[PDB]
RNA sequence: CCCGGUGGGAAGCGAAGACCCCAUGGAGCUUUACUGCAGCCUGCCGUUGCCACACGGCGGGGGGUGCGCAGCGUAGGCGGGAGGCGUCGAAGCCCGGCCUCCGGGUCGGGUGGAGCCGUCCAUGAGACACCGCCCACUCCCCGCUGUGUGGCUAACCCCCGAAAGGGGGGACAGCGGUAGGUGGGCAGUUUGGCUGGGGCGGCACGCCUCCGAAAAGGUAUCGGAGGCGCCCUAAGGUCGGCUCAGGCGGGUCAGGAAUCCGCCGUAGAGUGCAAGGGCAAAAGCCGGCCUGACUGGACCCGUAACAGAGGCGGGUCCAGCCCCGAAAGGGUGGCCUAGCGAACCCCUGUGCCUCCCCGGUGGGGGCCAGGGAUGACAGAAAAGCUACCCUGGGGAUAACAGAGUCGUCUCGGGCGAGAGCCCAUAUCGACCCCGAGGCUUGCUACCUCGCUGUCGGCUCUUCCCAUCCUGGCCCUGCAGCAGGGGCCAAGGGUGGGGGUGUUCACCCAUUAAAGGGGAACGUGAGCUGGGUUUAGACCGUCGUGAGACAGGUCGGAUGCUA
RNA sequence: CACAGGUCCCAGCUAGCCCGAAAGGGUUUGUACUGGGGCCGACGCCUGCCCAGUGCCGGUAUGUGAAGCCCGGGUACAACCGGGUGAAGCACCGGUAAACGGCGGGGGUAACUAUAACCCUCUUAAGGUAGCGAAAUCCUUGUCGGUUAAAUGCCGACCU
RNA sequence: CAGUUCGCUCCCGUGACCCCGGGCUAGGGGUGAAAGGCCAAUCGAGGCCGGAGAUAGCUGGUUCCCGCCGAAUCAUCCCGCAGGAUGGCCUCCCCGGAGGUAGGCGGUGGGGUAGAGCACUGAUUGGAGGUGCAGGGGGCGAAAGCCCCCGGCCUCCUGUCAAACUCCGAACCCACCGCCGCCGUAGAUGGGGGGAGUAGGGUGGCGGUGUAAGCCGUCCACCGAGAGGGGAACAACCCAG
RNA sequence: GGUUGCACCGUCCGUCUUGAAACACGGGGCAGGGAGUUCGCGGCCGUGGCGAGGUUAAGGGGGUUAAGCCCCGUAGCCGCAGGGAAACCGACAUGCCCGCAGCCGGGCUUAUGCCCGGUGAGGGGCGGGGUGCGAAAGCGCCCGGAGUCACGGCCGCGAGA
RNA sequence: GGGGACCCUGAGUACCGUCGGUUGGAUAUCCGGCGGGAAGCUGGGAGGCAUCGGCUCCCAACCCUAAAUACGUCCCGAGA
RNA sequence: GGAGGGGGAACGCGGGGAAUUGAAACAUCUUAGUACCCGCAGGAAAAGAAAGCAAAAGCGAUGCCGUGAGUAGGGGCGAC
RNA sequence: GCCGCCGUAGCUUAGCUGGUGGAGCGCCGGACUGUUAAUCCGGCGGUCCCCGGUUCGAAUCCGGGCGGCGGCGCCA
RNA sequence: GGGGCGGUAGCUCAGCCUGGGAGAGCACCGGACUGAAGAUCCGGGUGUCGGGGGUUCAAAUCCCCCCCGCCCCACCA
């Protein structure tokens, strides 16, 4: 839901308390780069077998959260469990 | 699925489709080999057949250097007519010159696409190209289905109008008639539909009397697909 | 024992049932199923040449052009910088070329002939003082390179000719190679499972609650009620204070609300949300603070009782880091029980290993964790038709007949409200209640799917009575003649025609009366073969289509020597 | 079923369509009175209306649209990342039903009882027209009439 | 007679007719006046050979004897329910080694089914007496009036009974202990290893559904896989192993 | 022993099946033929050799008529140390306690046998150890020498199986 | 044997880029096709990604090759 | 003047190239470069004197057998 | 018997996140008109079908009910 | 997810690149106009103009993050 932008939590890194600052997660591009490009090789004419890959899912009436919990005074960043599902995740400004 | 279709069939030239050619009489020629400038050429018209395969009436023509070639029979002709050809050939009927040389205005027919490859336009019973205009650059002619195409003034062609007109004027009578008509000629038939025609043999039409899907077909379709109203810009009659 | 006859039985012989179901069977056919593949369109490269033109993009120089608004006025931007300019020839008159917002600046001719500017200030930002580089549209000679159009002819191609040579067209096209698109023309396949057989429909296919559930535990059905596939960063955590629905009496109002005071008040309130369970100096209410819904790594339980079982959840420790509270002490998220997601893949984040003699760099692999889907929910990537079917099987399962049953069906009994002129019961008889049969329908799946041949009809024969006539009787609202109603009784009788494929039923005229039901819904190794449900065809409806229909309709074989 | 007749469609022959792995080939000793493909199915009278949806066709500024090349970035090179350029194709516009197909519902009202020539309303492009009709229409043996003594028939009629 | 025939009857019988010989077109191909017809007793894709001993969760069959023990037809998971795997269960071998606890009594616990009822959650039947009140009918109604009046909303003694109610609550099942019994040192009880088998039926009890028979649970003697004796016979009743 | 009369009892066989004498399926009769097989690999079992090692395969010498066996070859496999993905590191030939068998002691019954105390290999239970994860802790796996080869058979899988 | 440029030293090849086929071949197989395309031993390739340096090895694009190894037509010998 | 064609028991070398099946479905994968088809040679073929190998150390043609090893490696990273 | 979908001013129809309510038609009162029609101003009624429930409140969102509309009523 | 376009006064949008307090027509209220009605003119206002934040004194379009619709692709272990 509303979530606060700032909120003290545990660093593993520095293992003591500070505050940490919330974003959200978010999608890269593929293309080179990977055992999924280098399955482009194998669907040579006639079909791949794998990269032939599902026909249409989806999309779970939820989401997940996907967040990233970055340390103020170090600024490196540790993710938790999500799995905390939300519909929505709104961050507030302070 | 199915199997090959009734047009598929056709371009094999397997033999139930394929023209007889021991029945059907001679081709026109008219020869370039003793070219068009510096003629030297009349002749005279031998005896007049039927070509079964033409649906019209042919003639055989002795040439005067010695070469029997017909030449696709014109209007009004009498046997013992003399046809010549070259440009210096007299402007009148049954003669031959080329279209430069043939006045604007006159019917003309077996008009040449090519120099000297002795007609391949306008050889069928009754119909007749019109030279509308000519200029020493090209001389666009008329075809007997309204259109017109730009040819060089250096074709040849024969000055009248072919014989065995009202040809389609009469009826075919019956299916006898016909019957004997199309073995003169060469014309898969009896031809059904494919209305009746089990989902096997035909793309449309099942079982019973009813379309399948649409009559009307793509450009870029398959062949054993490209059946019905080919590529119709329209259809039918209203707006 | 034998002969002859007719075929009643031998669920007689000919069949591993075409009907139906099931099988991760097959095949044909269809399509806007899934995925591929010819053909066609189309860009690019090679084939592939010459002139021009116009034109896109660089790349070098260049060259006019800059109304935020005050305003001396058209301030385009910063920075060096208030002085640069002026015989290193100025105003200010007279035109010429000029773009343009005709706002007004720029500029070559010449008269001249010795000054002009801002500092000053206004202006959100200051100089048409000057010096740099820019950011505007824009235009152009030249150097490179694309693209479009036309001309040419030397490749190549279509015609003619034995050849020589010429004609039409031309870097188009054609061919080779590749890209995208279209593409049931062609090919491979799939199209689940649950199930009162199966299909529509529903899904009880994942999961939660009470019950069913037999007072430990387990525990099923398309078993009852009725939900979850999110919401919440406070609706959490800890701590302090605090007690409620509803009712009463006083208050305000039309009443009533919110608001007010007192009294009653063991839970009817509330606690997100089903249900159930938990709870009153609280887990509820209010307020403050705070962010443990933290990191790591276990035990144990559930999942999946006992009893193997993945993912997931939870209780319960201990270490580390915080929080709160005075402290004890608590916090492994929301009082509990729904809010559930794999291998592989990819992306994320941190720290660490590694990449073929070796070092360095790029780009990789890997260990770990989080997040992204499979709701057919322990996860295939996925539409239909088949009466043209085919196969493996099954009476583990439908149609038919039988059995069982008996809601329905037929018949019968009790009670007797009430009507029949008075009079329940001559007759008629509601409400309600109880039986018999197996003759209609339905339920069942016991038998049968290596075939017990369907109906109807015809023909032939037996049986049953709850009896239509006939005989013998009782009552009567029985005068007669004629009825109504009841008993005995199957010995005999119970027909002929018209429509319909018709068992039934409708009608006609007769008749004493023209009763009902059973026998593989009697009767196909007897006939008949019209109808039902093959393969041909048509119409209507439906469907994109194949194709379908217990919709209508014409036609559609009836084996065997006992 | 063919069928004569009718219509729609395509192609200027170096075609269109069709066959072929390819070379090549059928039509074709063929050239629009051809010859190829569908639809309908002699004659007689006719053939309404709709381009919304499907299909086909023509076109497409604009958006969009691959590989190639180009430019930018990356890499000592390369992978790679980004943008322009982006053809057919799509979105988009028009035509087109003798192309596939569609061609509706309620209410209220007339000397009198009936009905409604009449008038409202709305979907979704249009709203069943000439005809024919209880049909090679469920209910149903409609109803009436013919026909039969008697006809779930046939025939004629009405026709919702 | 005939793996498509016979007689009568019937259609055509100068033709889109019939016929002979030659010759052409071959299997997703031909050919079809188009029926999915025909292409050599074979056609909704011919035949031959090979792949090929295809593969089938599916039918059938699977052969000497004797001795000993002796089942389950359930559970979870599964494009799975006509099948697999893994447990329970059955059976075989080995290991360690002193207890094990089917039966009954007592002690200490667990419990909401029979029954029963008003004590809740709370459905409902009926009339008295309170007249505590929100309102649809009437009246002197001088008018929401002062005053009574009638559906009625809820106390009281009473009044019907209540899968998914409970003030209560058996018999009865079950955890542990002690005791006795029994069972074991000819080795139990427990552990490891090898081999299976995953259609049930059925009376009765208790059910759930269903008019019912039947279905589906549950425990159940028994049949399966168990004779013999008896119930006339009679899978599962009785007697009996 | 053959045959038959008499008493008593008995509705084939096989298979399907919950139930078959069956109106479920199969069979005229008889003769012959006819179905758990081979290789590889894994998991078991019995038995045998050798021994912290063990066994050869391929091979050529040799012998023989040929050939097996004999002796020779030791490549390779597994075992002898494990853990970890990898980097990379690397452990108990015994410290403690029960106790089966047996041994040792006492008591007891005529005897076998029994009851009770040490000692206890084998076995059982701790501690300390190696390594991985790991700030740490806590677990995971491992730790005080038995295997290898051989032969028969059971069973799995791939193969027509 | 050592003395100068050492002999020049194989082309559509090596290699690069685009599509397949195939293989175990992974970025790191091999072979084709399409487009591009070297070097003159003062050189080139190879050591399982690319590139640069060291290090070690070896000369493709010309050709042939006994023997040891396959078979069962034929002969002989052999048989749980 | 000299040659070619066609045959040949299997083997050999070079080309074309499936599916039933397996993955309990099936498309990649699998069957499998198998079946089947074309060209061709001999008595053996082919390969063959490194542009090799890569325990980096050590080797100096090539077949073949044992083994490596069911290892590395590929693959719905599933079956294989 | 199954599975969708309605009812809204006298009629017919828009509409709804739960805080609303209209249009055309009829009807009624004025006004043009000689009268009237047409035309022209002014209006109003809706528990938004019944009946539960949740909510602070339901016309709206769920339960149930009633009448009206389509689609299956079969291969067997 | 990528690319592009449109969401603005009650309504439909105009002003991207082409910058300001800023818009236009139509509904709607008022005034002209005709015997009547209508149409057609003249007034009136309804958005700093999609949210939130930034550069600008002043920005709808510029910038950083976006909701929603729309169209073309790519993509779902």
């Known amino acids: ?94 | 699925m199915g199997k090959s279709l009734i047009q598929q069939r056709r371009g094999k030239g397997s033999p139930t489709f394929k023209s007889p050619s021991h029945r059907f009489r001679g081709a026109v020629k008219y020869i370039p080999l003793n070219y068009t400038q510096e003629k030297t050429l009349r002749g005279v018209v031998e005896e007049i057949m039927h070509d079964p395969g033409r649906t019209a009436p042919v003639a055989r023509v002795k040439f005067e250097n010695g070469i029997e070639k017909l030449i696709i029979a014109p209007e009004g002709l009498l046997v013992g007519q003399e046809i010549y050809i070259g440009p210096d050939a007299p402007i009148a009927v049954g003669n031959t010159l080329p279209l430069a040389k043939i006045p604007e205005g006159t019917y003309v027919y077996n008009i040449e696409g090519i120099p000297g490859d002795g007609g391949k336009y306008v050889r069928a019973g009754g119909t007749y190209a019109l030279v509308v205009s000519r200029e020493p650059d090209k001389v666009i002619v008329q075809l007997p289905s309204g259109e017109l195409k730009a040819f060089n003034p250096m074709c040849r062609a024969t000055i009248g109008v072919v014989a065995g007109g009202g040809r389609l004027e009469k009826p075919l009578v019956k299916a006898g008639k016909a019957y004997y008509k199309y073995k003169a000629r060469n014309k898969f038939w009896p031809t059904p539909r494919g209305v009746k025609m089990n989902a096997v043999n035909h793309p449309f039409g099942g079982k019973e009397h009813h379309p399948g899907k649409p009559t009307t077909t793509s450009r870029r379709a398959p062949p054993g697909r490209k059946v019905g109203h080919i590529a119709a810009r329209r259809t039918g009659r209203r707006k």
């Open chain 1, 1 to 94: 839901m509303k979530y606060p932008k700032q909120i003290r939590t545990y660093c593993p890194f520095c293992k003591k308390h500070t505050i940490h600052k919330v974003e959200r997660v978010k999608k890269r591009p593929r293309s080179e780069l990977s055992a999924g490009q280098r399955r482009f090789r194998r669907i040579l004419k006639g079909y791949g077998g794998f990269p032939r890959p599902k026909p249409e899912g989806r999309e779970k009436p939820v989401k997940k959260l996907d967040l990233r919990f970055r340390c103020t005074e170090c600024g490196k960043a540790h993710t938790r469990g999500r799995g905390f599902r939300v519909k929505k995740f709104e961050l507030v400004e302070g």
